[model samples]
Target: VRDAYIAKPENCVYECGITQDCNKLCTENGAESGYCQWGGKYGNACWCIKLPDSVPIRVPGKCQ
Candidate 1:
């Protein structure tokens, strides 16, 4: 696996206005941190980053 990965928990709130909210959501689900991702099929989503190995990757691929 790469140094980090992005995952979206199914139960998390889909949209996030600020990264702090997203970070809180992600950390609650076991992610290291998170951010608001844009320009995607789902529009804005809380993307959990640096997830632990146990967390399944929902949004695959590394940072560009």
Candidate 2:
């Protein structure tokens, strides 16, 4: 899967990073990583710096 990689994390915002595991989320689930702005209307949102395309975008959200 790591062949001819023409794709990479976008510079803009992305929809992802949600993990209730031990009250931790995002990179915490793995080991840990860089900065990411976390926020939501209630408890349903994520502000990834370099999020994967596999994540789903929120309906009540906007961005590119």
Candidate 3:
């Protein structure tokens, strides 16, 4: 499986904050890891990485 990004968790209240929290959230939901990526369509959104094909991808158009 290639590395990809998914939108913030449905259970997340606000935009992604710290790296630790994002990592926890992503791992909890089945992602390899997570990051609060900045300067994109979705600023500071929790983008889950190393996702499988089953996960719904939600990233910037450029990345697509």
Candidate 4:
């Protein structure tokens, strides 16, 4: 496992706008918090930060 993969455990892909709104959903999903991610391929996805370990990551946009 590399650093990136290890870090992946604390992140989740969800839906929302900006970084603030995304945090709400992240909390609902059992995450500590989250932020909005900017990416052309992902189409602005919301990623949960400080994940609770039990949370599952969902691809927010196209897998390109």
Candidate 5:
């Protein structure tokens, strides 16, 4: 995901701009167990916690 953002301008958004979509994706993917932070110069990034007995893991977006 970090690579994607670096390669594509559209994939990048300000930390403040990427709020709703990020949270929403996380929750839908059953990985609602995470937090977001600014990548400093890399924009916004999300860190997710791995839950036990999880089958499918979805990447969370920077939105709600």
Candidate 6:
């Protein structure tokens, strides 16, 4: 069986342009409970979230 806790591609975004940079930001920001995901046609999108505690942080117009 697959690891239930493992994050999936659908559950999260991959191939994002800002994935590296954004993830770095999240780590540097000292986010307590959150993960960074990317989503977009060109993989140039990213969002940060503190699941069950905070909402997703989008780059405005990026999600749309």
* Candidate 6 per-residue C-alpha lDDT over 1-64 given as tens digits, one digit per residue, 9 for 90 to 100: 1111112233443333534555555445444333334434434344443322232333223322
lDDT of each: 0.59, 0.32, 0.60, 0.49, 0.39, 0.36
Query: In model 5, which residue pairs have backbone atoms overlapping below 3 Å?
Result: 19-63, 20-63, 20-64, 21-63, 21-64, 22-61, 22-62, 22-63, 23-63
> In candidate 2, where is summed lDDT lowest over 10 consecutive residues?
1-10
Per-residue accuracy of model 4 over 1-64 as CA lDDT, tens digit each: 1011111232444434643566666667666666576562446666556665454465333332
Write one digit per residue (lDDT tens) for candidate 5, span 1-64.
1112111133333343446354454445454354564563455654444432342322335433
Assess the local accuracy of residue 20 in candidate 2 as a C-alpha lDDT between 0 and 100.
30
What global local distance difference test value does model 2 have?
0.32
The sequence of per-residue lDDT tens digits that candidate 2 reaches over residues 1-64 is: 1111111134233333544331234344232222323454433334333334453223433334
**Where in model 5 is the C-alpha error above 4 Å?**
1-16, 40-43, 51-64
lDDT of 4 at 43: 62
Candidate 6 off by > 4 Å: 1-19, 33-36, 40-44, 51-64
The per-prediction CA RMSD against the true structure, in angstroms, equals 6.7, 10.4, 5.7, 7.0, 8.7, 9.4
Sequence-dependent TM-score of model 4: 0.49
Runs off by more than 4 Å, candidate 3: 8-14, 18-20, 59-64
How far residue 29's Cα lies from its native spot in candidate 4, in Å, is 1.6
The TM-score leader among the candidates is: 3
Estimate, for each residue in 4-63, the C-alpha lDDT of model 3 and write its tens digit: 456533433226655447677677767788776664465666667777677666643443
| Model 4 lDDT, residue 61, Cα | 39
| Per-model TM values vs. the true structure | 0.52, 0.25, 0.57, 0.49, 0.33, 0.31
Candidate 4 or 5, higher lDDT?
Answer: 4
lDDT of 1 by residue, 1-64 (tens): 2223244455233666654476776777687777777655656666777777776555543332
Ranking by lDDT: 3, 1, 4, 5, 6, 2
Q: Which 10 successive residues of model 3 have the least lDDT summed? A: 5-14
Q: Which stretches of candidate 2 lie above 4 Å from their native place?
A: 1-24, 28-46, 61-64
